[PDB]
Amino acid sequence: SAIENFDAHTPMMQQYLRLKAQHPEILLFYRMGDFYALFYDDAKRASQLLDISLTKRGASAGEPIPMAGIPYHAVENYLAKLVNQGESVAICEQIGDPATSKGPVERKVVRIVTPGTISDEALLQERQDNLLAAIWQDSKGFGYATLDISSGRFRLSEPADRETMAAELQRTNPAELLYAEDFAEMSLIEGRRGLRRRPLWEFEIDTARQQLNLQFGTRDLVGFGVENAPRGLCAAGCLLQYAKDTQRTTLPHIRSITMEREQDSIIMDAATRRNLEITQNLAGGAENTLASVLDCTVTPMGSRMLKRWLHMPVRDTRVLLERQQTIGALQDFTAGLQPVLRQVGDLERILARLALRTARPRDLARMRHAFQQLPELRAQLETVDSAPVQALREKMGEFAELRDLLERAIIDTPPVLVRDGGVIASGYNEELDEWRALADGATDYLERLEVRERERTGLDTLKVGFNAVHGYYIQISRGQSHLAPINYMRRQTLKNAERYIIPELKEYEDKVLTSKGKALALEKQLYEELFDLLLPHLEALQQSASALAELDVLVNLAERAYTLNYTCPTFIDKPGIRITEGRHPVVEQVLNEPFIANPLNLSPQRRMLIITGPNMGGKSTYMRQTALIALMAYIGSYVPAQKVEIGPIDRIFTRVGFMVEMTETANILHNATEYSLVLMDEIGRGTSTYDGLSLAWACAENLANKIKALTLFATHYFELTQLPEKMEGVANVHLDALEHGDTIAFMHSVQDGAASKSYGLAVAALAGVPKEVIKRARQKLRELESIS
Amino acid sequence: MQQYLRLKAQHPEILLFYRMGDFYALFYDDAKRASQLLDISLTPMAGIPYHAVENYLAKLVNQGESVAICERKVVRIVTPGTISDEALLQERQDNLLAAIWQDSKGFGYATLDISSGRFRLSEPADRETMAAELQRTNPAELLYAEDFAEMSLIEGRRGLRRRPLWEFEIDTARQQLNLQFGTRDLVGFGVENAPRGLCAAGCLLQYAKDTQRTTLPHIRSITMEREQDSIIMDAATRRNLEITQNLAGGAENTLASVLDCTVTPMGSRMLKRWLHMPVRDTRVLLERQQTIGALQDFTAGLQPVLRQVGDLERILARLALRTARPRDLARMRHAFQQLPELRAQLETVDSAPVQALREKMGEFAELRDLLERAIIDTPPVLVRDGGVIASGYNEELDEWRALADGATDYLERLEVRERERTGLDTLKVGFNAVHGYYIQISRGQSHLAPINYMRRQTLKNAERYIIPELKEYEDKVLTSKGKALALEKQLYEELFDLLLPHLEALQQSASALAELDVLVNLAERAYTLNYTCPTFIDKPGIRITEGRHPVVEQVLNEPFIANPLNLSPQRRMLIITGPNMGGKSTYMRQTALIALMAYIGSYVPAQKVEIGPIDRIFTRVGTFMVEMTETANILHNATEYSLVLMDEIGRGTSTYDGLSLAWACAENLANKIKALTLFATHYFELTQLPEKMEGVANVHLDALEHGDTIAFMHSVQDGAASKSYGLAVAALAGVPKEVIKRARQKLRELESIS
DNA sequence: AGCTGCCAGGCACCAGTG
DNA sequence: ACTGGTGCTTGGCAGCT
Ligand SMILES: Nc1ncnc2c1ncn2[C@@H]1O[C@H](COP(=O)(O)OP(=O)(O)O)[C@@H](O)[C@H]1O
Numbered sequence A: 001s002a003i004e005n006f007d008a009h010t011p012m013m014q015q016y017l018r019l020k021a022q023h024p025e026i027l028l029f030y031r032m033g034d035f036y037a038l039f040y041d042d043a044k045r046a047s048q049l050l051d052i053s054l055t056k057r058g059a060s061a062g063e064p065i066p067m068a069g070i071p072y073h074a075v076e077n078y079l080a081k082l083v084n085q086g087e088s089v090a091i092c093e094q095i096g097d098p099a100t101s102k103g104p105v106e107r108k109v110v111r112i113v114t115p116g117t118i119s120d121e122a123l124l125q126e127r128q129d130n131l132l133a134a135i136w137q138d139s140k141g142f143g144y145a146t147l148d149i150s151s152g153r154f155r156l157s158e159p160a161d162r163e164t165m166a167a168e169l170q171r172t173n174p175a176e177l178l179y180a181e182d183f184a185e186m187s188l189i190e191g192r193r194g195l196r197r198r199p200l201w202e203f204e205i206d207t208a209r210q211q212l213n214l215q216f217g218t219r220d221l222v223g224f225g226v227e228n229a230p231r232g233l234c235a236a237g238c239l240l241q242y243a244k245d246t247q248r249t250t251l252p253h254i255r256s257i258t259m260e261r262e263q264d265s266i267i268m269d270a271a272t273r274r275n276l277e278i279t280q281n282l283a284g285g286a287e288n289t290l291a292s293v294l295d296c297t298v299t300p301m302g303s304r305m306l307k308r309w310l311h312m313p314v315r316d317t318r319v320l321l322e323r324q325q326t327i328g329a330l331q332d333f334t335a336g337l338q339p340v341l342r343q344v345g346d347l348e349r350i351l352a353r354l355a356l357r358t359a360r361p362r363d364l365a366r367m368r369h370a371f372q373q374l375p376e377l378r379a380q381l382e383t384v385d386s387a388p389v390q391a392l393r394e395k396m397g398e399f400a401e402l403r404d405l406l407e408r409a410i411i412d413t414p415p416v417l418v419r420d421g422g423v424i425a426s427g428y429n430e431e432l433d434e435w436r437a438l439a440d441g442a443t444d445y446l447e448r449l450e451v452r453e454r455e456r457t458g459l460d461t462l463k464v465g466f467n468a469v470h471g472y473y474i475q476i477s478r479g480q481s482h483l484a485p486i487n488y489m490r491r492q493t494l495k496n497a498e499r500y501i502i503p504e505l506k507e508y509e510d511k512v513l514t515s516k517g518k519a520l521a522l523e524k525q526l527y528e529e530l531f532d533l534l535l536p537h538l539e540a541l542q543q544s545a546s547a548l549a550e551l552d553v554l555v556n557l558a559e560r561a562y563t564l565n566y567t568c569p570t571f572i573d574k575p576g577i578r579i580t581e582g583r584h585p586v587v588e589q590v591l592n593e594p595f596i597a598n599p600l601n602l603s604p605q606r607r608m609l610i611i612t613g614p615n616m617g618g619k620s621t622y623m624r625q626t627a628l629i630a631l632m633a634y635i636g637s638y639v640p641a642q643k644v645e646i647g648p649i650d651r652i653f654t655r656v657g658f659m660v661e662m663t664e665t666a667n668i669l670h671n672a673t674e675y676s677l678v679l680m681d682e683i684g685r686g687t688s689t690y691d692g693l694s695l696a697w698a699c700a701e702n703l704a705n706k707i708k709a710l711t712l713f714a715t716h717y718f719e720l721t722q723l724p725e726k727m728e729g730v731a732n733v734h735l736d737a738l739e740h741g742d743t744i745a746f747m748h749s750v751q752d753g754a755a756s757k758s759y760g761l762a763v764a765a766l767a768g769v770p771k772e773v774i775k776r777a778r779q780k781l782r783e784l785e786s787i788s
Numbered sequence B: 001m002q003q004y005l006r007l008k009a010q011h012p013e014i015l016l017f018y019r020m021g022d023f024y025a026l027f028y029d030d031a032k033r034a035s036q037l038l039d040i041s042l043t044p045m046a047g048i049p050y051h052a053v054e055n056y057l058a059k060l061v062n063q064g065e066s067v068a069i070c071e072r073k074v075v076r077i078v079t080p081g082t083i084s085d086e087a088l089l090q091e092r093q094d095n096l097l098a099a100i101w102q103d104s105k106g107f108g109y110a111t112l113d114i115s116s117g118r119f120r121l122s123e124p125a126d127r128e129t130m131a132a133e134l135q136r137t138n139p140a141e142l143l144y145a146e147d148f149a150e151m152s153l154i155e156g157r158r159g160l161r162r163r164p165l166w167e168f169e170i171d172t173a174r175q176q177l178n179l180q181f182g183t184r185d186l187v188g189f190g191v192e193n194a195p196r197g198l199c200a201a202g203c204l205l206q207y208a209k210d211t212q213r214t215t216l217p218h219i220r221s222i223t224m225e226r227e228q229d230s231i232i233m234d235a236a237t238r239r240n241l242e243i244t245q246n247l248a249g250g251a252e253n254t255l256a257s258v259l260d261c262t263v264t265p266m267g268s269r270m271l272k273r274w275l276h277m278p279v280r281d282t283r284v285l286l287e288r289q290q291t292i293g294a295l296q297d298f299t300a301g302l303q304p305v306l307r308q309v310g311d312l313e314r315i316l317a318r319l320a321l322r323t324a325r326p327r328d329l330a331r332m333r334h335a336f337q338q339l340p341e342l343r344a345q346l347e348t349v350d351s352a353p354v355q356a357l358r359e360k361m362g363e364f365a366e367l368r369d370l371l372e373r374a375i376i377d378t379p380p381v382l383v384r385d386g387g388v389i390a391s392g393y394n395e396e397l398d399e400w401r402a403l404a405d406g407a408t409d410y411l412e413r414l415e416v417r418e419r420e421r422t423g424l425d426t427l428k429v430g431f432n433a434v435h436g437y438y439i440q441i442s443r444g445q446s447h448l449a450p451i452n453y454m455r456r457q458t459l460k461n462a463e464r465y466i467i468p469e470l471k472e473y474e475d476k477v478l479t480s481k482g483k484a485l486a487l488e489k490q491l492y493e494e495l496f497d498l499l500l501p502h503l504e505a506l507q508q509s510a511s512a513l514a515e516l517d518v519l520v521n522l523a524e525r526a527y528t529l530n531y532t533c534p535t536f537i538d539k540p541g542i543r544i545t546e547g548r549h550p551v552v553e554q555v556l557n558e559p560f561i562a563n564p565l566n567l568s569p570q571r572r573m574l575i576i577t578g579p580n581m582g583g584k585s586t587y588m589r590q591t592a593l594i595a596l597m598a599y600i601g602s603y604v605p606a607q608k609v610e611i612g613p614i615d616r617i618f619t620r621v622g623t624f625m626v627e628m629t630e631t632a633n634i635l636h637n638a639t640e641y642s643l644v645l646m647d648e649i650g651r652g653t654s655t656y657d658g659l660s661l662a663w664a665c666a667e668n669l670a671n672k673i674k675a676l677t678l679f680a681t682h683y684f685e686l687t688q689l690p691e692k693m694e695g696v697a698n699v700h701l702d703a704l705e706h707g708d709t710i711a712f713m714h715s716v717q718d719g720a721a722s723k724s725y726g727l728a729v730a731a732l733a734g735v736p737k738e739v740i741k742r743a744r745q746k747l748r749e750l751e752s753i754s
Numbered sequence C: 001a002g003c004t005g006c007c008a009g010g011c012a013c014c015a016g017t018g
Numbered sequence D: 001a002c003t004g005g006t007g008c009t010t011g012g013c014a015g016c017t
């Protein structure tokens, strides 16, 4: 509680506070000898989070300074505890030599670990992307950018309204979200993880243009298709600024940025994504999703690509025909290709570490093991006549020169780190073999000296050993210690042994340690040199990884189509969906009865189906599976049906029934087009009897007669089956059921026309409502049916 | 590690921690399971470090897993329903062991709180009651029999423990229970002709004894809960009223978050029991009421003193099991010190019950004085290293400590002696496991060491030595300290011998202190929260004047609107129309909370409540299948003494189907069951019910259109609603104007037929 | 094969001679 | 201003049983 002016502090705390001032809201690991230290509330916080001791560094002038810390070699385990709780940590290191330093040794922050910029294998999940995003809002729209720092994939977009922006955050699921201080729609964003408020000036348009061109080495961003997009460039500017500030090295794997137009994909609202269960079931988990079914990729990078595709269907007809083509060609070849692709591993993330210069020995080894599969894949894919498959074979590369480089440079199975040597192999550098060979009197020399001195002295307890603190020694037991040569100079004393040193053992100590250190310092120069020779080829290597990943997805999708009995869909010119014996791709796996296949005929003249049928009749499944088939068709995949013809689809909307249901419904009515697939599931709620139904009725009318979209409209309201009569483009279908005394069977089959009756009382009876009460409700019911 | 597999065979159905240096190790399916539950990794290995073991045990026991520890041999086992250690328990949450079993007649159920020794027994008549007892009691560990049909009752539950059929034999269960209690028969606890419940209680106690391998002398009694003794609340109702736990599985915005301002964790747990088990016997209720009125003026004085009494109940458990640690005894002493101050404060209270608690609370001045002398002010966590017995308690101990201190003082002066005598300013005297005492000199000065010094250990920058003088006094220190430590331990075990004869009385005290905590709390809650004392009538009825929902009114900073209620046998059912938006559901839910609180003996949020007998409370308030299943249960089980609250049934099916069931339900509830009922509905067509039959009236909620919004009033008014608001809400949400115009047209067309 | 306690190394603090 | 001791976080492992 003293006045903590600059002069009141020790030279050390002056330096620590300037560094902390650059990172005021986040934890600062501050290298001091063998320990990262934290101070003040960082220490206190660290103590709770990491479960380490909160103590004090003593102080002559005033208050003791709260302190905690960890040994430098245990850091990665502590970084993991933090990043999993969404915490950033600024890592500070000693740059200077203490012996040539008057005051405190020079200290820089060299890195900042944040949830969205982590690239180490230990902190990531193999099969999930981990993205950094930036968001900003004008009075008019949103800018959004994402970056996979462990792949270079750098994207820009401009969502026009609240609900697309929501859909975009849902889809990309950023691990860390940078946002502007003036952001108005905080409902999209509060209660997200890795939330990071930024000042407005980081989203300035001129600085982003300048920094992105600098990064890409371009004059303008014309070539990238984003010069057009200031809204998005602003968020991209911030993102890149934050990415540079965390890593504090060059980032040469970020060579490109791509715009994501609304026209290029099918925009699925937030409800659609949740209700289709693409990678997340409605109960939060990852089981019984569409990905649980379709995803038997064999590489991490492949699984991450497949999930991105599921999530972003493409509209380019050419790309889709190329994908389908590939899938049909490789059908026979999946048993041969999968085991081999598996061995390539996560080459994508390894190349990120190569680019960041963080790549460990076992990354280089696994890169080598990937290069070694290329020829078998090249040979396996030659046979396959498919122009798209050959284009991937070509992009996949070979890198025989680099494969040999790593085969000669690094041993078969190196250790986890370079810190303690034993990575570079014999023959690679002859100066190293000479330095290493001097540090191999460890075998012969020391032992011949033991024997020799034991026999010369006659003292049978005499041994030669080493310890790190006192060095090489000759040990005699305490019983015999008094008979040792008077030449033996004393070095270390123990309870029951005395240890000594002689000029010849000292001479050997001095050469083994100065040559072990020189063998390490050359080995680390040589290993950092491996980066120099690999890095020039990084562009080709990244293209290669993406080719293998694509190959893995497409090989998987081919194998899926065979095993799960799927067909190739075709595309038509105008809106419409014709399905023959289609199935819910997920429900038909997780369900131990037969799945009843069902057709669907949707067109511009038959654009709205009023779906009826009893509760648990199959109404929602029918809708979901329609959308899932649409989705699977539009990633390029074969589809769970006897046959599918499908027209263009711009957006998919879903409403699954307070103020929220009506607002959602309004967004649909405002943004759906003749090309949209609209799924309304028992909407329309009011405070009285017909209140809610009248809204649903007017809504349907607007969808049918003014919007002309392709709507599926499940209802409990039998009154809506009068709609086809009155309204062009509308028709009735129902889910079939059979009554037969005290019971009801759900047939799960779509028929044309309205249900003959509604089965609410039958469902009530099934649920256990007393027979006497159902007797009375049927009586009442007939009174009502007699009105008309 | 063939040693691991054969120890795993010893207890194959239980997880097995297996010691390895710093860690406990789990292999095979043990590892799989444990990484799933604890957020740790695989290798099929899994490691849990030694310094944190108690923590990981507490999680696994919280999740229904027994654990075996192994140091080779299985030395210790923790089962979820039999722990009494403080680190393994949650202060304000009960933790029961339970046993269920089925007969060709009906169910048998028993529960034990192993800390308090509260032992219960029941004989649920059908499966629904049984399911309601399982939700209510939420046992940490459930014993069941091999021959058990109704597995859907207990399928999903944690802590399941399949047991042989012979473990439920009646004659063996009687003998064991009568041994446990010092009785020849069970007539005195009122359970001697309840054989099914006894069979469950026999298995539970066998199992409890087996987990402990100790007498359980604090289990001296068993009580039988009865159907008619309490207000039955099925699981759905219990969850809907948000008594201890909210709908999101939390502790906030719940009846306990407002009512439970108790000051000891033992009284908190007792209040939560009271809330989940409303009693019907108005005698007991009338006593709690009188007590809450009489204690009003004594609340501020009592609660600070009561607070200091602490969780005496659970400490007493560890006295019974002989695991109490020094701070248990200190906390227990600290609580004895409060008894005089509580006796004085309560003496003046005009209440027979408060005075009966005040006696039952006791004094224990001899035990207070014993622990004042025996133990120091703030003893360490463990007895293991001593420093727990205070000076003056034992003459032998004091003398051993004095010779220790003097041998220790001599070695301090030996340091100063040697240090001035040699002139070497770095000379000190350390102690060590390996070398005992030693003299240290720094490496720079170590060559000036006296010739009599004997090197034992070189360090990087010092040298340590013994002389025989060091060794001589070292002997005096370690022997004296060791005699003192053996004596502290024996004197500490002697405290258990002096306390335990008074255990029956101590348990009575803690139980009384807990009740008082609760009543003093409810008394302060009535005065602070403007509650009133409800009166009981002889026939079904609820008259509320200006009643409120006790949670909603403390939580939301919008003014709470109070409402009347008038249910009698001539006015059994209200049809409630108008917008919902939480207003209807709150009025229904506050009715149930007021009934519940009345039948806990608490005061209630109102100006006046009169209330007849209630046997059951049903609230269907929140698929169409789930709505109908809950409705079926109401219709099958409700009586003329029941309170039924229904939230717009008929939603999720056709208009005419949902209207037909609604009308049939209302009609059945009014003309057959005759239950007191609040029937919320959107069907305007149901407002004709009052014209067709006696006992039914219409009430409603309106809204108010103003400015650019709508204000949904929470005032219940006589008569039917004359307005719908679904289209106005659509308009406000931005549904295009032309669409609303059409819906307005369609709505008129639809209602005008009707 | 378990337990204890020195050590890793920057820095400030501190107390004994200039 | 200086020589030479001590203190401080956790994890590794030497030096004891
Ligand atoms: N075509 C089908 N074949 C077999 N089972 C089906 C089929 N469609 C639906 N089901 C099953 O019936 C259940 C009810 O489906 P659902 O679409 O939710 O009915 P609804 O929405 O009309 O109430 C689903 O859980 C699913 O398992």
Ligand SMILES: [Mg+2]
Residues within 6 Å of the ligand: A619, A620, A621, A681
């Ligand atoms: Mg449905």
